[PDB]
Amino acid sequence: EDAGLVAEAEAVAAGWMLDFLCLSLCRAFRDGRSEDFRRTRNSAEAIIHGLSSLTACQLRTIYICQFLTRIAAGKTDERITPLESALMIWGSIEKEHDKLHEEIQNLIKIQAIAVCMENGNFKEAEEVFERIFPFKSKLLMIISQKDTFHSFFQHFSYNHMMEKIKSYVNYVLSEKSSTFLMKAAAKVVESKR
Amino acid sequence: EDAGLVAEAEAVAAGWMLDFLCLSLCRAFRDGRSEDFRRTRNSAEAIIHGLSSLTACQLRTIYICQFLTRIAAGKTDERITPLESALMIWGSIEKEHDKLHEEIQNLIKIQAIAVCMENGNFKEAEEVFERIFPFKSKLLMIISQKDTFHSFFQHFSYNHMMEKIKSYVNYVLSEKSSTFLMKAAAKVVESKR
Ligand SMILES: CNS(=O)(=O)c1cccc(C)c1F
Ligand SMILES: CNS(=O)(=O)c1cccc(C)c1F
Ligand SMILES: CNS(=O)(=O)c1cccc(C)c1F
Ligand SMILES: CNS(=O)(=O)c1cccc(C)c1F
């Protein structure tokens, strides 16, 4: 056997596993299956360690997985919160900055502050505000008054953030629905049955 | 879409990933590629968390992976050493107890003691001896005298243990060489080249 060709076949298989695990992670995020999401994320992280060179498509795939991981840890080394880390990934993925991209960005920006207020950590809420940001003075007064349920926070809500992110996830899910591993697996299941 | 059929396709794909990762783990163990082995092992462990029901074949596959993991940590919660844990797995795998099985068993039994002596921990070497075992009195005198390079230890050597285990690994490697994921990956590589 040729060690070089074996390593190449392993890299091809790792690429197939990555797309399958991104698909699975997307579905688990959409369905709210927390434990399944946690398990798929762990598998994705481990599989990604086996890849040392990634194409542009594979980089988008791993950054979508990292972004969803941060969003899922939103209410739970970097010196920033998970939602701030999701914002950094979101603003750096090679993707179009369309209307949906902007809506998700602004929702994460507000929720990075609101999740701290929901948890009763108002000093952290002001620290998140300072790192991200008359609009600013209005938002700072709201945080300062612990006005967690202000109409601004109710419009830029956690539920609205999750709904917009789930709409984006449906596009990723559609784009990867035909990838090799899930497609071959669905054929085996349809043949049974 | 049907959640039940999606979960079934994910279980089929996990089964394919498990066989591919067992193959990769076996090759890495045979080649002495330590870092590749460590990475494949981490991926295998994570993938196996996604399976809640295993067939007899899948149980053999995960126990072969666990056995090789313990052997690889041989010189590096359970209250026993890695080689003692490899011995427990080895004696419980659903496999034929042929000549090779016995040779590997006896080599691990001696090496579980010898690796402690190699590391200069003779109290641990006697504790391993007590947990595993005129032959016994001869072996205990050898450990007691720190006679690490006694002709008995040179015949039941670490190198001999690794050679016998590698011969067994070649049978696992041959048995799984045609599994779905590695086979489809090799076709893609051969088409390029
Ligand atoms: C999927 N992408 S990843 O590169 O495996 C990754 C790296 C670091 C942290 C996380 C959560 C992560 F998911
Ligand atoms: C600098 N703030 S902003 O980006 O202009 C802004 C204005 C209004 C609402 C939101 C969520 C927002 F992020
Ligand atoms: C592959 N089998 S396994 O079940 O993932 C496993 C469980 C516990 C410890 C180890 C090292 C292990 F590999
Ligand atoms: C109880 N000891 S034993 O199993 O009979 C034995 C005899 C000789 C050599 C070895 C390695 C051995 F394990």
State the nearest Cα–Cα gap between B175 and chain A, in angstroms. 16
For this PDB entry, the determination method is X-ray
Q: In this structure, how many other beta carbons lie within 10 angstroms of the beta carbon of residue B76?
A: 8
Task: Report yes or no: A128 and A99 within 8 Å, Cβ to Cβ.
Answer: no
- Looking up tokens 């609205």 gives A160
Helix (H, G, I), strand (E, B) or coil at A81: coil
* Nearest-by-Cβ selection for A188 from B12, B188, B189: B12
Closest-CA residue of A relative to B187 is: A9
Q: Which residues contact A106 (CB under 8 A, 6 or more apart)?
A: A156
Residue type, A188: V
Give the number of C-alpha atoms closer than 13 A to the C-alpha of residue A46, restricted to the C-beta side. Answer: 22
Q: Does domain B3-76+81-186 have CATH number 1.25.40.210?
A: yes
The CA-atom distances, in angstroms, between B100 and each of B92, B97, B105, B138 are 15, 8, 9, 25
Rg (CA), chain A: 19
Q: Which residue in chain B is spatially nearest to A12 when comparing CA positions?
A: B185
How far apart are the C-alpha atoms of A30 and A72, rounded to whole Å?
Answer: 11
How many Å from the N-terminal Cα to the C-terminal Cα in chain B?
39
Helix then strand count (H, E) for chain A reads 10, 0
Q: Whose CA is nearest to atom 5 of ligand 2?
A: A135
Phi and psi at A119, nearest 5°, equal: -80, 0
Cβ atoms of B74 and B60 within 8 Å: the answer is no
Q: What angle do CA B20, A67, A92 make, to 5 degrees?
A: 110
Closest CA to B189 of A16, A5, A4: A5
Question: Where in A17-114 does DSSP place strands (E)?
Answer: none
Question: In this structure, what token pair is assigned to residue B113?
Answer: 């003691």
**The Cα angle at residue B156 between residues B152 and B162, in degrees rounded to 5:** 160
Q: Which tokens in the block code for residue B176? A: 């799984």
Taken in order B124, B127, B131, B137, the sign of the CA dihedral is positive
Tell me which amino acid residue A138 is.
K
Which candidate from B9, B17, B182 shows the least CB-CB separation from A9? B182
User: Using CA atoms, how far apart are residues B2 and B5, in angstroms rounded to an integer?
Assistant: 5
Residue A117's CB is within 10 A of a number of other CB atoms, namely 21
Report how far residue A185's alpha carbon sits from residue A190's, in angstroms, rounded to the nearest whole number: 9
Whether the CB of A135 sits within 6 Å of ligand 2: yes
Mutation test residue for ligand 2: of A87, A101, A109, the one with most atoms within 8 Å of CB: A109
Asked if B176 is an interface residue toward chain A (Cβ–Cβ < 8 A), one would say no
